[PDB]
C-alpha cells in the first residue's frame, strides 16, 4: 500500500508578471520535495530528511524538469484562455496530479495523470493508460489533439517505468521514516459526549461511539479528530499506531 504523487500548480498573474508555478511531490501521502518559482533561487528542495541523501545531480536534474514544466504551464494557460474566451486581466489556475499506486509487494497497481482548470476536472488519462477522459467540450479539443499525436504513450512509460523505480528507491531510503507511526492519545469530554483522538500519525483513523469533525493537522506532523453523541452506556479508537484498539467512556 504505497504511492507517489506530484501536485503541480500554475496561477497566472494579471500584468507583466508570469505565472507562479509550484510543484509538490508526495511519497505515501507525505510531502518529500517542493519547487516554487517565487523562491529566491527556484530549485527543487528536500522536504523529508531521507531526501538530503540525494546528491547534487538529482536536484540539478529535478530542477530542470520543474523549469520545463513552468514553461509548459505558461503555454497551456494561454491556450485555455482561448478555449474558454477568458481575459488575461484575471487570474487563472492550472493543476496537475500525477504518479503511481503500488501494492505491498511493490508492483504497480495504477498510474494517474489528471488536469484541472479553475479547480474543476479538465482532462484525465484512464486507468488503461491509453485513452483520455475529457470533462467538457473545451477539453475535447485537447483530447483530440492528444490522441492524434499519441501523447498517452509518453505518460504510460513514465508511470509504469520511472514512477515505479524511483518510488522503490524512496520507499527503501525512507523506510524508517515511512514505517513510523504515532499512536493517538484519547479522552472523553462532557457538555454531548466527545471522544478525542490526539497526536496520531498517519491521519487514517476510526472513532466509533453521531457528529464527526474533519481530521486536522496539529502542526507538528500529527493529526487530531473527535467524535460526539446524544446521552455510562457508551467509544473505540482504531489506529495502526496502537498496540491494540483503545476503549473508553466518560471519566468521573
Amino acid at each position: 500500500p504505497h504511492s507517489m504523487r506530484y501536485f503541480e500548480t500554475a496561477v497566472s498573474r494579471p500584468g507583466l508578471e508570469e505565472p507562479r508555478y509550484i510543484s509538490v511531490g508526495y511519497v505515501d501521502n507525505k510531502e518529500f520535495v517542493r519547487f516554487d518559482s517565487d523562491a529566491e533561487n527556484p530549485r527543487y528542495e528536500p522536504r523529508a530528511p531521507w531526501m538530503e541523501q540525494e546528491g547534487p545531480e538529482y536536484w540539478e536534474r529535478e530542477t530542470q524538469k520543474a523549469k520545463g514544466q513552468e514553461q509548459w504551464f505558461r503555454v497551456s494557460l494561454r491556450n485555455l484562455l482561448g478555449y474558454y474566451n477568458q481575459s488575461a486581466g484575471g487570474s487563472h489556475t492550472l493543476q496537475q496530479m500525477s504518479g503511481c499506486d503500488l501494492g505491498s509487494d511493490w508492483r504497480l497497481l495504477r498510474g494517474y495523470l489528471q488536469f484541472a482548470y479553475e479547480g474543476r476536472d479538465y482532462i484525465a488519462l484512464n486507468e488503461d493508460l491509453k485513452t483520455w477522459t475529457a470533462a467538457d467540450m473545451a477539453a475535447q479539443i485537447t483530447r483530440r489533439k492528444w490522441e492524434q499525436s499519441g501523447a498517452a504513450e509518453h505518460y504510460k512509460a513514465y508511470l509504469e517505468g520511472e514512477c515505479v523505480e524511483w518510488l522503490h528507491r524512496y520507499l527503501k531510503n525512507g523506510n524508517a521514516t515511512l514505517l513510523r507511526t504515532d499512536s493517538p492519545k484519547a479522552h472523553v469530554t462532557h457538555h454531548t459526549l466527545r471522544c478525542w483522538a490526539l497526536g496520531f500519525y498517519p491521519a487514517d483513523i476510526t472513532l466509533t461511539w453521531m457528529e464527526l469533525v474533519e481530521t486536522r493537522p496539529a502542526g507538528d506532523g500529527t493529526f487530531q479528530k473527535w467524535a460526539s453523541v446524544v446521552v455510562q452506556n457508551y467509544c473505540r479508537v482504531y489506529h495502526e499506531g496502537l498496540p491494540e484498539p483503545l476503549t473508553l467512556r466518560w471519566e468521573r
Partner: peptide
C-alpha cells in the same frame, strides 16, 4: 522523480 509533460493542452 517528476515528469516532463508532452503536448500542451
Amino acid at each position: 522523480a517528476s515528469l516532463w509533460n508532452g503536448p500542451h493542452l
